[PDB]
Amino acid sequence: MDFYYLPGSAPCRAVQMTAAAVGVELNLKLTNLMAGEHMKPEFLKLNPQHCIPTLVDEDGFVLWESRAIQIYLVEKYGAHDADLAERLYPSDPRRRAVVHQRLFFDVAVLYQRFAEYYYPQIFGQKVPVGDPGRLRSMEQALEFLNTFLEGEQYVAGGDDPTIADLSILATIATYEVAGYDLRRYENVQRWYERTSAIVPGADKNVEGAKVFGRYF
Amino acid sequence: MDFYYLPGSAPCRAVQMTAAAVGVELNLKLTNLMAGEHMKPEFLKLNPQHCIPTLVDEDGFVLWESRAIQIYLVEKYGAHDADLAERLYPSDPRRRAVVHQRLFFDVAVLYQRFAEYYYPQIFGQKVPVGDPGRLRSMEQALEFLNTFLEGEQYVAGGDDPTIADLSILATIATYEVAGYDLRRYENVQRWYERTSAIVPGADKNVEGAKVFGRYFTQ
Ligand SMILES: CCCCCCSC[C@H](NC(=O)CC[C@H]([NH3+])C(=O)O)C(=O)NCC(=O)O
Ligand SMILES: CCCCCCSC[C@H](NC(=O)CC[C@H]([NH3+])C(=O)O)C(=O)NCC(=O)O
What we know:
The structure is a homodimer.
Chain A lengths: L1 E4 L4 H12 L5 E4 L10 H6 L7 E3 L5 E3 L1 H13 L3 H7 L4 H30 L9 H17 L14 H15 L8 H13 L3 H12 L3
Helix pairs in contact in A: 1-3, 1-7, 1-9, 5-6, 5-7, 7-9
The structure holds S-hexylglutathione (2 copies).
Pfam family, one (chain B): GST_C_2
EC number (chain B): 2.5.1.18
Family (chain B): Belongs to the GST superfamily. Theta family.
């Protein structure tokens, strides 16, 4: 299973943690976006959206969007351990719906607002000071997550980390290395430190996040 | 099942089409965002993220994010018709993964880039011209969609529309009412007209998108 990735990339790290969780060994194919590797035909042919992470399975099926890959890894490759699949991706429609909402929250709100605030400062033009409005918006997302975590060990509830935790862990590790004071959000910090301690492959998460940290 | 919504809202319309597809009646509850109705304490208690659509089921279970609601509607309320659920949301992990990718594409790329380009023009400050970079990015998303649809009837493949078609249909109807010329993207236009002519709730989608046009009278 080929895995087109960068360690700094949060969505890549989310897949790496999920692959570790289900015992899938990824064949790592470092894909240098700064060089322009993702715009080479061999990547474009596989993925016309030219984005990482991209997974290519045993049969040549190509998949992207980290959170879609996460689900695929559990459904297909995690299936063999039924209690494991149920922990990572509970099948009850209500429980699963919360997992889904947290995944969409991560892509569309939590990580999105992180990117809109920080990317202008660290990429492209590299603006000295972040936008006050984009900052308030990002803080609102952290406040949402803090609220989700009130009286809850994990982001989507349950007694074990789900793929939503793994996704949001990749995101929040990126906040940390960006130098955002996560201790302002008590539930987020508590969840972050505890889940990082227990989730397999969280090492790669912190290590890769440190790579992203080099932009700051 | 209570449905906190506005007809103009694309994600609300995606839920409307999905509920129609699975034969679920929504108790419609207009929620005026400009009026701060989503910020009332009782609403925040149901949904601290204060966003629409919000669905409250028969047991008081509260759910938001339209695409999570779409999946929930199929699994809990559509699945009694096994064939119908399989069409809307195929269970084979490979086939389902493409459906999931398209749903995530819709929220994070297609609709997101629509919002980033048009919202500054229609909300708050109301800038007389859209940002060129944001326009290029939005066109790129339409280009991606057009490519997905090359030689295919539906967004995630298959012989029938899925929940991904319904979600992206709500988004593209919003492109249309914004005045974007979709004939620039032949596969998108072809798919849009065809799917609008066949799916349940397409009436709600077009009527609601027309309402969103209230922001684009200039
Ligand atoms: C090492 C730090 C560099 C910044 C890392 C950002 S992640 C790279 C980016 N990937 C994505 O935005 C994928 C997002 C998608 N929502 C997912 O979760 O997979 C990309 O391939 N962008 C290129 C493109 O889309 O063309
Ligand atoms: C402000 C209106 C913009 C025009 C209509 C956009 S849809 C309304 C908007 N809805 C959402 O943020 C939900 C998006 C979510 N991704 C989904 O698909 O459900 C909202 O409730 N926004 C208010 C909020 O989140 O506080």
